[PDB]
Write a protein that binds this DNA or RNA. Structure first.
Lengths: 121, 109, 83, 95, 98, 98, 85, 95, 109
DNA sequence: ATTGGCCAGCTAGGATCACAATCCCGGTGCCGAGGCCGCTCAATTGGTCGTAGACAGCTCTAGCACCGCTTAAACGCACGTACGGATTCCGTACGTGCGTTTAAGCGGTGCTAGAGCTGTCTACGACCAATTGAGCGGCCTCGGCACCGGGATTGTGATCCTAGCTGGCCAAT
DNA sequence: ATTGGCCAGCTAGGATCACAATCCCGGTGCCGAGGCCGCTCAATTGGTCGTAGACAGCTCTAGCACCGCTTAAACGCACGTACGGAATCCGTACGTGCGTTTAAGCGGTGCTAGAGCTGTCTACGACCAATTGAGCGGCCTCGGCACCGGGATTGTGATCCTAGCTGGCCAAT
């Protein structure tokens, strides 16, 4: 019979159990008063990665707490970022969250994280 | 006393000239001696290949609604057929152009 | 006469057209000098072989057949010139 | 009257009429086919020549062409071409 | 007011120059180039037009295939602009060399 | 306690297997492979040892050159790990094909 | 007498490929590449052996002589020196 | 007494002594050189053959070898080889 | 009455056998007739190339402080010389290995 | 209520130490390289024949040169988006080093298909002359198709409308 | 008396429009594809003759098969860290478009080198027969080189030390 016409092959190459940070009016006031570039470190903690500085104000303001529980592996992953931060920026994260600005490094870690597990007015 | 001369071609049922092939073989000094069936077989082979090419090309012509085969239809026929493209992969066909191939990535979304 | 510096006659847009035929969408302005140099090399080879056949025949016209045969040596056989 | 250059055009034409009676072919295409046929022929014949010296053999017979074909044409071409050639040479020997 | 987004007309151009077969390099400049090259091997050569035409078909084919390969490389680097490093690469892999 | 940083011993290994010439594939497995392949073309073939040896030299050379080219590609993508997309690329450019 | 040697391509073991790559100057190798490169190899050998066995069938011998293999490669455009070519 | 297979070994060995009197050569190397010489020879001779048919010419003379050489060997090899060959054939014709 | 037989080789001042070349040319059916000076010239060419290869290889041997050429030396000689590498670029030399080439990027800093 | 310094602690880089890898020097033996011998076949030598190819002469094709006009392509610039490429971070997939398994390597024996050579002979192909009809060039013509223009469709970019948030005013607070 | 709802302004997504690139269809006039004819010479036909290659028969080298120790390598898994690759944001260089400049292309004319042919004749190579010594294989023997044990050197990885910075409390403001 006739051949079959074999064609060629070619090489072709977070809104958990809390109130939103925009609904928590004091935190919304801080997020409106600070320059957007302050928020990067917070969004890094909130999502384990900071997004665009264009969306960053939305990304922090729309957050309503972690869905998780304290002591869990995700909480430990939040402690990793907070322990890798430094006390001045941790006290700024306290200030914009309306948290009091005192504490040793490990207290700043646990106190910020206990709040961001359940952020409320 | 002389049988009616009929070309070996006829004896073979081919369109390509067998005798011409024979002559070329002996004129090419491929060997001091050339068997009788060799030019027959060779002619047949060439004929076949030609037929194949011309078939595919003409198909491609009917796809361009073109009745007459031009160098592009050969290029299309060959490159679209894997078996030939392997045969003729080192070959550049004048006035053949290229087979349309825009790499996927290059197209916008 | 001494023809000189004719390689610029392979003008930028002509390289751009060849690239388009290749399916090239975007071309860095540095390509042009590279592709001219490449092309000069190529020609040098082809023409050396063609001229050499010519010399051997003692013709003085480089003949289409000579170019085809040169290419055939390079493994670049050309169909459509009497090969 | 001057020296006349042999080509294969008319045969290609005949083949083409067998395959596509309604279809014609441009001169340029014919030059392509001429060159192509010549090239294939050269490859096969040269292969045969070498494959015959290789065996300290002097004669290209159907066996050498067949072998050469199998070497050069890849797969389905090899098969069909071989089969056809065999058919043709059979028919030739029968008459 | 009308202005194509960069890369649109380019894609139209590609579709055009692939559908087409005509010679992409102006003939007369290429001819004068060929003659310039020959001038190093033999003085006062004469080229049949057909010969020049053949060389052009060959040189175009060569470059075209070169750019195909080059483009392949460039895409494979997740780039889109082909750069000389991509051509040099293409040649090095083909076994052509600097 | 001693542990080479990853990529050191690798570099030592490279320097070794380039200074050396000996056959990099175990001979007997390659032999059995060759015969496995032949089994499709002709039943109960017999291979001169020399033939197998030739095949091996060829096979090794081919792959070696392939990896050279592949590595070139991979570096050209600013990568270090050669991957199958790099081999496929190498072949496509050489004119070998899938 | 006659035994099928199926599924023997895995005999081109991972470390062997690793050694060949090192000869190529390859520093770091994906773990998935090995099945790809076996497939590549198999292809290559298929072609070579095809041509070799072809020659042998023509000579009417039943043993693919080294001379066949070298000549096969020569046609692949990959001439091999050192076996009587 | 059995069929004896021609090679070039002894000549290669002579050459080598002219180039490196203190140096010897392994058998394997010799097999390489044999193959190499054969390959070069084949390329040149085949080129000559084709370049003679190309001219409708029947006879390979010094001119065809010379041309073939120029084609195959790149640059400095071409030059020196041509020069040497010319020298040799000159000396041959002189005596 | 018979002049002292001296090989054409001697007449040419070559180490390669001219007569052997001649015989091969006629046994290869390159052409029905082979000119007298063709085997001379050819032998000379081959001789030259051989000489070149061996020279380079032996050089490379003294660099390995090795007195005797082995395939690796040939591989080194050839690949390190551009002109030959161009000539023999499609050639795989059994037992030759590879020319040491660690790409710059791969080296740590 | 804020700011600067101190003790303790921490981290980075330059150095120090240890060890493995690499190299180097020299002794060992072993086996493949290199030399010698007689034979034989291939190379050489001489005389003959013809024919391939060098050379000269003629024709005339076609390559070169040059001009002018038209015009599309090339060039140069302005402009702005998308792209390349730098940066950072993360996860995991490689790499590395253990112990374990396994089958590669080696050497040996036994078996024999099949490589290789030789002799017979004749089917096959070379060569020749005589035949001739297939194939080439010239010419004539006539349909395919490249081009043009109008209409239609599609694709692309530009634009508008609506949904949402933020800012100011009047009315509410 | 002051500022949050109401409206106005800004922005993003969907919808809409403009318009120009593509397609489709007819018509048209062109000129190359295709047929015809006559002539030529390469294909054919028959006969003859050498001749090389199919074939059987032979000898034996070399491939295959199987076996059993000995390692070295392949293997699997644990551990971890360097890598690939997703994100990100910068500069900008490359595209796109416009207006101006250049020369490619056409075509037309004129000139002549040199392609291509033919005819002469002759040096060169095929060929044959006789000659012979260069090259082969077989034997032998002996030096290069792989190896290995011991040192020496370098490269790598791990470690210590010196330095600068950070935090809480105390001292000073």
């Amino acid at each position: 019979g006739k051949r079959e016409k074999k064609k060629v092959e070619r090489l072709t190459m977070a809104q958990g159990k809390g109130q939103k940070l925009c609904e928590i009016e004091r935190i919304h006031f801080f997020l409106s008063k600070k320059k957007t570039d302050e928020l990067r470190n917070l969004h890094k903690l909130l999502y384990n990665r900071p997004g665009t500085v264009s969306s960053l104000k939305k990304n922090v303001g729309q957050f309503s707490g972690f869905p998780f529980e304290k002591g869990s592996v995700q909480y430990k992953k939040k402690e990793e970022m907070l322990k890798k931060f430094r006390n001045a920026m941790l006290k700024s994260i306290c200030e914009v969250l309306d948290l009091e600005r005192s504490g040793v490094n490990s207290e700043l870690v646990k106190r910020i994280l206990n709040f961001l597990m359940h952020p409320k007015p | 006393a002389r049988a009616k001369a009929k070309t070996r071609s006829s004896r073979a049922g081919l369109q390509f000239p067998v005798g011409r092939v024979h002559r070329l073989l002996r004129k090419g000094n491929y060997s001091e001696r050339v068997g009788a069936g060799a030019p027959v077989y060779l002619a047949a082979v060439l004929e076949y290949l030609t037929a194949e090419i011309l078939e595919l090309a003409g198909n491609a012509a009917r796809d361009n609604k073109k009745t007459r085969i031009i160098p592009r239809h050969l290029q299309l026929a060959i490159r679209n057929d894997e078996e030939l493209n392997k045969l003729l992969g080192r070959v550049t066909i004048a006035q053949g152009g290229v087979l349309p191939n825009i790499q996927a990535v290059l197209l916008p979304k | 006469k001494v023809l000189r510096d004719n390689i610029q006659g392979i003008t930028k847009p002509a390289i751009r057209r060849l690239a388009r035929r290749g399916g090239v969408k975007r071309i860095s302005g540095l390509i042009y000098e590279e592709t001219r140099g490449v092309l000069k090399v190529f020609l040098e080879n082809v023409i050396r072989d063609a001229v050499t056949y010519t010399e051997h025949a003692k013709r003085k016209t480089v003949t289409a057949m000579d170019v085809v045969y040169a290419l055939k040596r390079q493994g670049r056989t050309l169909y459509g010139f009497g090969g | 009257k001057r020296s006349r250059k042999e080509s294969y055009s008319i045969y290609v034409y005949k083949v083409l009429k067998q395959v596509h009676p309604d279809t014609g072919i441009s001169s340029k295409a014919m030059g392509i086919m001429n060159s192509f046929v010549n090239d294939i022929f050269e490859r096969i014949a040269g292969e045969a020549s070498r494959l015959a010296h290789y065996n300290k053999r002097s004669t290209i017979t159907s066996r050498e062409i067949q072998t050469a074909v199998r070497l050069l044409l890849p797969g389905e071409l090899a098969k069909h071409a071989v089969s056809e050639g065999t058919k043709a040479v059979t028919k030739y020997t029968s008459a | 007011p009308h202005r194509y987004r960069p890369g649109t007309v380019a894609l139209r151009e590609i579709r055009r120059y692939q559908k087409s077969t005509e010679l992409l390099i102006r003939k007369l400049p290429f001819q004068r180039l060929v003659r310039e090259i020959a001038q190093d091997f033999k003085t006062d050569l004469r080229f049949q037009s057909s010969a020049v035409m053949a060389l052009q078909e060959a040189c175009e084919a060569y470059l075209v295939g070169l750019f195909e390969d080059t483009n392949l490389c460039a895409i494979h680097a997740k780039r889109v602009t082909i750069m000389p490093k991509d051509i040099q690469l293409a040649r090095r892999i083909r076994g052509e060399r600097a």
